[PDB]
Design a binder for this molecule. Sequence first.
Ligand SMILES: Nc1ncnc2c1ncn2[C@@H]1O[C@H](COP(=O)(O)OP(=O)(O)OP(=O)(O)O)[C@@H](O)[C@H]1O
Lengths: 108, 109
Amino acid sequence: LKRKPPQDRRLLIMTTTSAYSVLQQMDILSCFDNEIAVPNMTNLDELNNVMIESNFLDDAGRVKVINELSRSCPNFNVGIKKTLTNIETARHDEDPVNELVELMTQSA
Amino acid sequence: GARYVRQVRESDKSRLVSLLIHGPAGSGKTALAAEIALKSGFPFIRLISPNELSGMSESAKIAYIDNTFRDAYKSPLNILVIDSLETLVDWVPIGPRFSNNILQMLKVA
Ligand SMILES: Nc1ncnc2c1ncn2[C@@H]1O[C@H](COP(=O)(O)OP(=O)(O)OP(=O)(O)O)[C@@H](O)[C@H]1O
């Protein structure tokens, strides 16, 4: 990761990770020229945007589930992958808000 | 650096002079060493770097090191640049892990 290409060639490398602390301990963090960060979802309106994009809310469901989780969960932090999986599995049985509420509450 | 180069050039008893160039990471050590070596103006100059040893096995690496050090015992004036000693022995502080063979070879070389 620190070898220049021969002659007049060019190269861009992008490497992902999820164990930043481990990389710090290994003492390998000096091979990188910068560091981007990707955070989780931390708001209800973002969940609403995901819902409208996934065609699940049907408006009334949006209101009911958002209202329920407004007071049913003080802190909310989940990734996009798990949220999409929860939405998809909720679609099958009991499309009503209940199933999604339980899934989201337990996942968070 | 220039003073040390002159001393090795002139003295008739000092037949081996070794230096260490240490500092914080990213401080620019290799550039300075290369500059000194270039401006010295000696007939025989070589460099050993991690890049050259990539992909080989332990025995191949030891063979290469021994060959390079043997090539330098001819001629009456020589210069060698060994780069990034700590990564030539595969150091990692978790174990800690490293290679004893290469380390011992360099220590005796
Ligand atoms: N004395 C110096 N004056 C100006 N630029 C310097 C000097 N020494 C090094 N540089 C610059 O530093 C860059 C190369 O850095 P160099 O590889 O020497 O760093 P290093 O700290 O030895 O590296 P490493 O992080 O691999 O241990 C080049 O851009 C070179 O011009």
